[PDB]
Paper text:
We isolated two distinct structural classes of GltPhIFS protomers after symmetry expansion and classification without alignment. Thus, we observed both Na+-bound (GltPhIFS-Na) and apo (GltPhIFS-Apo-open) states. In contrast, it flips out toward TM3 in our GltPhIFS-Apo-open structure and the previous GltPhIFS-Apo-closed crystal structure. The consequent release of Na1 and Na3 leads to a restructuring of the NMD motif and outward rotation of M311, which now packs against the open HP2 of GltPhIFS-Apo-open. The guanidinium group of R397 remains between D390 and D394. In contrast, the helices restructure significantly in the apo conformations, particularly in GltPhIFS-Apo-open. Only in GltPhIFS-Apo-open, I350 replaces L347 because the HP2/TM8a motif, particularly the HP2 N-terminal arm, moves outward. In GltPhIFS-TFB-TBOA and GltPhIFS-Apo-open structures, the transport domain leans away from the scaffold far enough to open a window between the two domains that connects the interior of the bilayer to the solvent-filled crevice on the cytoplasmic side of the transporter. We observe excess densities in the opening, suggesting that lipids enter the space at a position structurally symmetric to LipidOut (LipidWindow).
Numbering used by the authors: 2 to 116, 126 to 417
Amino acid sequence: GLYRKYIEYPVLQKILIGLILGAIVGLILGHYGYAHAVHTYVKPFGDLFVRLLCMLVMPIVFASLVVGAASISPARLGRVGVKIVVYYLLTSAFAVTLGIIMARLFNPGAGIHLAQAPPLVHILLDIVPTNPFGALANGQVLPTIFFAIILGIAITYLMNSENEKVRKSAETLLDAINGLAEAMYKIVNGVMQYAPIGVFALIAYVMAEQGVHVVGELAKVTAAVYVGLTLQILLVYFVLLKIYGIDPISFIKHAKDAMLTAFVTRSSSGTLPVTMRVAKEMGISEGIYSFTLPLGATINMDGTALYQGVATFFIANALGSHLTVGQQLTIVLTAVLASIGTAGVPGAGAIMLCMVLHSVGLPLTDPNVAAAYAMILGIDAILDMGRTMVNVTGDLTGTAIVAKTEG
């Protein structure tokens, strides 16, 4: 069947064919005068994709962090877990200040001109929600991050209670929330199946209404991701191995297969048996990598910082505004903190792009924001490839360092 042949086709080879045929059609219709037809006919096939991406940002964020923070064992994270969560806190501080520097050296969105701050004691006091249901009903991503982590921790204090009724009740609540999380992981597969038509429509009406300087500046955001990404490999992981004695040249020759696997499959959780194979081939003992790789699958803020350091700068310069370094540090550190614990799930790109509109602060009713937010939702697939690639090699680096220290 034709529908079965269309679904059976792989997704990463489908969004790219959607994107190329979007850009070509939007150029050859944007030049030939037929452009008001695109905004009335093709644009609602992309607006539904933008709404489908924002439909599932909140149940993923709640039901993923509850079932994630209810997996924390306080006796498992004794010595190796502390070294890991100090390592990722060190590497995230390099990734933020390198994704900001590479967004500053490039100018993503300089010539796509289409055409008020709370204090630091207010944001950290607005993290705590006054109403958790009201934090879910509104947008309020970071309050439901906080309430989800608190509810996730407070269940494992009940599941090992001396009682049985509260233990059975806590198990049933955790299983219901885990079922909601798996349902929202199953929905994102159908949304990504719809994604070629949506990316086609979005980039088609963008190239139709603007022209060729969109692809001129869109071959700049991808460049500012990727040359900051390889630089974050060569200036962080290549020196963190050379400090701890392990030669980084043979490290890449070992981890090339896991890097290419994570590049193609576009998901760090799925490429885990390939990733543990390289860890076994590098002489790392079973317990070490068996603990650290499923931890680095979930909590690893390396690619998200490199993406949102340049995506927020592009969505700010494309909208006409202008940002300083101390004014965008407090936005990059907000988006990265909002995407915590939810970067290895299949719904990571949804939250990474929904924390861009909340980074601007303008709704999706104004046509200038909706014409610049689609421009990054076009190339999020090409960015997600390198994002997963730099996540997986960072996982391998943090396993190798801790294994060298323990051995």
